[PDB]
Design a binder for this molecule. Sequence first.
Ligand SMILES: O=c1ccn([C@H]2C[C@H](O)[C@@H](COP(=O)(O)NP(=O)(O)OP(=O)(O)O)O2)c(=O)[nH]1
Ligand SMILES: [Cl-]
Ligand SMILES: [Cl-]
Ligand SMILES: [Mg+2]
Ligand SMILES: [Mg+2]
Ligand code: NA
Ligand code: NA
Length: 326
Amino acid sequence: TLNGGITDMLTELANFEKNVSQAIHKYNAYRKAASVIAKYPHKIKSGAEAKKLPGVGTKIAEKIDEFLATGKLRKLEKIRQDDTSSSINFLTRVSGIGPSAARKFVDEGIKTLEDLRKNEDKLNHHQRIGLKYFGDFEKRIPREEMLQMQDIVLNEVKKVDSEYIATVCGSFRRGAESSGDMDVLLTHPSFTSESTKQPKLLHQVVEQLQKVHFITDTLSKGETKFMGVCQLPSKNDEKEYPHRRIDIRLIPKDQYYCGVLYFTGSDIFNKNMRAHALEKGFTINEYTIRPLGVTGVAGEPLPVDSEKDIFDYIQWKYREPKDRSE
DNA sequence: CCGACAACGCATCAGC
DNA sequence: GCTGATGCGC
DNA sequence: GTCGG
Ligand SMILES: O=c1ccn([C@H]2C[C@H](O)[C@@H](COP(=O)(O)NP(=O)(O)OP(=O)(O)O)O2)c(=O)[nH]1
Ligand SMILES: [Cl-]
Ligand SMILES: [Cl-]
Ligand SMILES: [Mg+2]
Ligand SMILES: [Mg+2]
Ligand code: NA
Ligand code: NA
């Protein structure tokens, strides 16, 4: 965090292009730069020094110069002023509300926490639940609490079928001191890239996780992807823990490594590794890594048996989870 | 220059 | 209902 | 917004 001010400045600009400008590339551009500049082991002295890192070009170099000189960026002061942009940015914090729905609500005249609460009838299931736990979701989860949640999720899963193997991924597997949510990868010998010898494999787990009042709400639920809410149980006369976001992703057991790699992130690390895979000539997803022929079309899955195998295919030295946080 | 930028599950809606 | 585009969050 | 052919 030698450059917290700059990386923070960049993130804001990224969120602005995303939520307000709906310019998804300008968004990612800024994120990448914020990232590269965040791993940079030196306290940037000037824009020039930054334009050396890949991801920081001219435009971002100048802003960093403007920020180092005055401790701020005029382009952001302005945005912070513009009322329409400020509303859109705030509405985009309610889970389930993207740039489109925000700008939409603003037009309808809904632009504050209050407006949303008196118009609950205009929110879909996801947005509704998101507003419900607006505050809670703003809070981070301490690793200590992540460990507790992990026991529950794993012991319960073991309860449904000792065949289930549940791995907590995300910022947790990358060993963070806190997480924005909990991400769980689930496998079961019955479900492979070859056959689903059992249905409701995911359903079963969510059902058990709901019986013990661990899962409290649902944002979306598919045959292999659950997006919901959970809560650590409290003791007598003990203030309740905040409600937490939990993702559950069921992946074919023979494709675990590609799946664990994906769900371990970071999202930027994946975006980079997948970009680099495409240059090396391959394509990677949470399922498999396939080669690319001249036609461009993806080939057949390559034999993977370790996260490291994927790294090799693309000629990238293996990086530990902790070193994938970008 | 200028085309590309990671990849995909689930919810919601339009058009048939 | 089904397919495909768009939205939203991984 | 940045970058590699
Ligand atoms: O756009 C995305 C988002 C997420 N992911 C992967 C990486 C990420 O770590 C994982 C789970 O997503 P989260 O939103 O949970 N991010 P992460 O757990 O890394 O951080 P946080 O602590 O915010 O949850 O999914 C992508 O590949 N692309
Ligand atoms: Cl600023
Ligand atoms: Cl695939
Ligand atoms: Mg997470
Ligand atoms: Mg998540
Ligand atoms: Na650069
Ligand atoms: Na949002």
